[PDB]
Curated annotation (Swiss-Prot), chains A, B:
Family: Belongs to the IAP family.
Organism in which the protein naturally occurs: Homo sapiens
Gene responsible for this protein: BIRC5
Protein name: Baculoviral IAP repeat-containing protein 5
Posttranslational mods: Ubiquitinated by the Cul9-RING ubiquitin-protein ligase complex, leading to its degradation. Ubiquitination is required for centrosomal targeting. Deubiquitinated by USP35 or USP38; leading to stabilization. In vitro phosphorylation at Thr-117 by AURKB prevents interaction with INCENP and localization to mitotic chromosomes. Phosphorylation at Thr-48 by CK2 is critical for its mitotic and anti-apoptotic activities. Phosphorylation at Thr-34 by CDK15 is critical for its anti-apoptotic activity. Phosphorylation at Ser-20 by AURKC is critical for regulation of proper chromosome alignment and segregation, and possibly cytokinesis.
Result, substituting residue 117 to E: Mimics phosphorylation. Disrupts subcellular localization during mitosis and prevents interaction with INCENP
Portion of the parent chain present: 1 to 117 of 142
Induction trigger: Up-regulated by COMP.
Function: Multitasking protein that has dual roles in promoting cell proliferation and preventing apoptosis. Component of a chromosome passage protein complex (CPC) which is essential for chromosome alignment and segregation during mitosis and cytokinesis. Acts as an important regulator of the localization of this complex; directs CPC movement to different locations from the inner centromere during prometaphase to midbody during cytokinesis and participates in the organization of the center spindle by associating with polymerized microtubules.
Keywords: Acetylation, Apoptosis, Cell cycle, Cell division, Centromere, Chromosome, Chromosome partition, Cytoplasm, Cytoskeleton, Host-virus interaction, Kinetochore, Metal-binding, Microtubule, Mitosis, Nucleus, Phosphoprotein, Protease inhibitor, Repressor, Thiol protease inhibitor, Transcription, Transcription regulation, Ubl conjugation, Zinc
Impact noted for substituting residue 25 to A: Disrupts interaction with histone H3pT3, no effect on interaction with INCENP
Length: 117, 117
């Protein structure tokens, strides 16, 4: 496996994790929607029953399908909504500050409620 | 209660927690071994059956009893051993960096093994 020892709490927060979710995804090489390229924007593998080419984003929630070899993920989600406060974040897990880490927990839980109400 | 939403994993890491452990402890006012004064060094309430005046330290393990109104906790533990890498740490939970947070987990688990072997 080769993965950290973090609980299910803030697992998705990890980059490797979001990338592991990607099983196949045709958009790999020669495309701006690669596993690591997309996961870096919050998008996590979540293909539907009929629409396998559907990549949704966590920490905000936003289903997006019909990608092409030239659709920046970070710009995609943000373009529709900046629900992901991590998009801008450019500091490794062990680089950012705790204060910023916890602050995220509030955002995630916040977005979840938005879905309902 | 008024306490964060952190799991049992790294609970003691919190200052308020280490302080909450202190039930009574005579050394409160007019002493250098107050609840907040000691907890700041890693010492957590842990009175024995016969020796209620015994304050041990976590993240290192070190039983110390027979305190007096002039025994710096941080200097006490360190004096005998610097098992607590947090002693020097002077940054609030949301102040320090993640890298330093995780690095601690290794120390704690390390000290635990030392006890056995
Ligand atoms: Zn997102
Ligand atoms: Zn200690």
């Amino acid at each position: 496996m080769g993965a950290p020892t973090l609980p299910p709490a803030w697992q998705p927060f990890l980059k490797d994790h979001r990338i592991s979710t990607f099983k196949n995804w045709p958009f790999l090489e020669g495309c701006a929607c690669t596993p690591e390229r997309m996961a870096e924007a919050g998008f996590i593998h979540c293909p539907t029953e009929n629409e396998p080419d559907l990549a949704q984003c966590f920490f905000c929630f936003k289903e997006l399908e019909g990608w092409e070899p030239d659709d920046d993920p970070i710009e995609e989600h943000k373009k529709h909504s900046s629900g992901c406060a991590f998009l801008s974040v450019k500091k490794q897990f062990e680089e950012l500050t705790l204060g910023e880490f916890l602050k995220l927990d509030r955002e995630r839980a916040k977005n979840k409620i938005a879905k309902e109400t």
